[PDB]
Structure 1
Amino acid sequence: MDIAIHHPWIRRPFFPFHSPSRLFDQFFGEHLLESDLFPTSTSLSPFYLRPPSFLRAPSWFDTGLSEMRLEKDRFSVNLDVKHFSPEELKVKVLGDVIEVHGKHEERQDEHGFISREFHRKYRIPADVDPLTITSSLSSDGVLTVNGPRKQVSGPERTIPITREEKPAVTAAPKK
């Protein structure tokens, strides 16, 4: 844990290409995402949906897919955060449950400040696997949890214990 040795020694080899931001693996990753999802060089390959939005000029489409084949396949789910909240949002991958918690103050009044909040609750063990599902985000709050998938889905438990039914028992007369 050489904080005064390794830390300044690991940030050194980064200098030859260090200066822009602290996060270099998402703008170039999403820039390629919006460019790879578009028929470049080759041509054709779509599939989407469309939920309610406040936008009049543009439109917010809830991205989604589905597939299965040989022995390998990718997938990507998109959370909902119409308004960006980079610092005011926290993504949590609690097992087979993906949830987003973003709150941003976009509406302002005299002495009162309004703060909207978007919270999604996804329980898709068939599309999620914490040991592989990561999380992406857009400048418009568009969260995108990419990664493989599996199966199964259910919260219920059902676990009875004891009950006996072996020693002490009851009964009644008969004939």
Structure 2
Amino acid sequence: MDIAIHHPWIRRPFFPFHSPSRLFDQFFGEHLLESDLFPTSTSLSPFYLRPPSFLRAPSWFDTGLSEMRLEKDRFSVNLDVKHFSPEELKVKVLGDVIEVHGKHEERQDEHGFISREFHRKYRIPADVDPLTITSSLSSDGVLTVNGPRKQVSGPERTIPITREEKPAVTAAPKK
């Protein structure tokens, strides 16, 4: 009418992941047993981008933003893994530690199996609280922990009386 267009993204949802048949079978319809599969084809009707790993594909590192992102609701820390898929990735938050474990099978042979691991590890009690810091991976393995650097705020941090103790709990503030 007035005339406008974007198009360069249109390649994406044909092959967002590897385009397995079991892929669009998870995201087409509804979980009943008569529901068929509509699983991938140059007949499907859309190709659609709405599943998790597919929006995080153009994000890729997911901005990769590692700091500043400070004091607010949305302190953020970027746990890099340089190249791994989500499943070889494995995040854990535990009191004063945030860690990512990555473990891939690089190459397989004879009776030999060649594992690579990435273990990016922290200890940051003043900065991380498992009650409110929250951990998000990108499809390349990069994990960002985000959120308020403050609910509990003690050493372990775990002095978590936050609902009713407020003076001492916040005497360690957004620091």
TM-score by length of 2: 0.44
Q: For the residues of structure 2 that align with 1:93 and 1:141, how far apart are their CA atoms?
A: 16
8 Å Cα contact 2:67-2:78 kept in structure 1 = no
Q: For the residues of structure 1 that align with 2:9 and 2:51, how far apart are their CA atoms?
A: 49
8 Å Cα contact 1:66-1:75 kept in structure 2 = no
Match of 1:152? 152
The verdict on how the C-alpha distance between 1:29 and 1:85 changes in structure 2, with shifts beyond 3 A counting, is: farther
The verdict on how the C-alpha distance between 1:134 and 1:6 changes in structure 2, with shifts beyond 3 A counting, is: farther
The structure whose RCO (Cα within 8 Å, separation 6+) is larger is 2
Q: Does 127-136 or 34-43 show the bigger shift?
A: 34-43
8 Å Cα contact 1:63-1:77 kept in structure 2 = no
Q: How far did residue 126 of structure 1 move?
A: 2.3
Q: How far did residue 157 of structure 1 move?
A: 13
CA-based RMSD of the aligned residues comes to 19.1
Q: How far did residue 112 of structure 1 move?
A: 2.4
8 Å Cα contact 1:80-1:142 kept in structure 2 = yes
Spell out, residue by residue over 1:116-142, the C-alpha distance to the aligned partner (whole angstroms, 9 max, x if none).
011122111222111111111011111
Q: What SS does structure 1 have at the residue aligned with 2:16?
A: helix
Q: For the residues of structure 1 that align with 2:125 and 2:174, how far apart are their CA atoms?
A: 53
Larger Rg: 1
TM-score by length of 1: 0.44
8 Å Cα contact 2:104-2:115 kept in structure 1 = yes
Number of aligned positions between the proteins: 175
- Percent identity reads 100
The verdict on how the C-alpha distance between 1:48 and 1:5 changes in structure 2, with shifts beyond 3 A counting, is: closer
The verdict on how the C-alpha distance between 1:66 and 1:10 changes in structure 2, with shifts beyond 3 A counting, is: closer
Spell out, residue by residue over 1:60-115, the C-alpha distance to the aligned partner (whole angstroms, 9 max, x if none).
99988798999844211111322224223321110121011110112344542211
Match of 1:9? 9
Q: For the residues of structure 2 that align with 1:70 and 1:57, how far apart are their CA atoms?
A: 26
8 Å Cα contact 1:77-1:146 kept in structure 2 = yes
Q: For the residues of structure 2 that align with 1:80 and 1:70, how far apart are their CA atoms?
A: 18
Q: What SS does structure 2 have at the residue aligned with 1:92?
A: strand
Report which of the two has the higher share of strand. 2
Q: For the residues of structure 2 that align with 1:133 and 1:28, how far apart are their CA atoms?
A: 33
Q: Does 59-68 or 77-86 show the bigger shift?
A: 59-68
- Counterparts of residues 1-175 of structure 1 (less than 5 Å): 72-150=72-150
8 Å Cα contact 2:84-2:140 kept in structure 1 = yes
Q: Give unpaired runs (5+ residues) of structure 2.
A: none
8 Å Cα contact 1:51-1:60 kept in structure 2 = no
